[PDB]
Structure 1
């Protein structure tokens, strides 16, 4: 499923609004992709499905802390 592991972002619902104010249902989707990150503590590559905001959070906090937080939450990585 299109669920970001780091942030939990998922597709949401909204409207296409035209020039005559006709409305139709639409979905806004996240910028989700698969990425391999190096982990020295375990000496391995970990593959995560995440967003660019998640990448920014990883850059800010470090791979070790984010991976530990996800494991504590319950994700198996």
Structure 2
């Protein structure tokens, strides 16, 4: 599943619009990558599939709170 595990972000459907206003279907994809993280509280490593927006949340409230927030809303499963 191509879903961010911290934010839940997935691809959205839109249009290409030309100068003559021809509209053709397109996909807006997520800036999604796999990254390894050191988890200070648990003294371990985890690998997450997150967006660049999810990394911003990790680098603001910390890893541990981000995973707790992600598990409440149902993003990590």
TM over 0.5: yes
> C-alpha separation between the residues in 2 aligned to 1:73 and 1:16?
33
**Alignment correspondent of 2:32:** 32
CA shift digits 1:20-59 (9 cap, x unpaired): 1111000000100001010122221110000111111011
* RMSD, aligned CA: 1.4
TM-score (norm: length of structure 1): 0.87
TM-score (norm: length of structure 2): 0.87
- Runs ≥4 in structure 1, deviation > 4 angstroms? none
**Alignment correspondent of 2:65:** 65
**Alignment correspondent of 1:10:** 10
- CA distance change for structure 1 residues 23 and 72 in 2, over 3 Å: closer, same or farther? closer
Gapped runs of 5+ residues in structure 1? none
Greater relative contact order, per chain length (Cα 8 Å cut-off, separation 6+)? 2
Q: CA deviation at 1:73?
A: 4.1
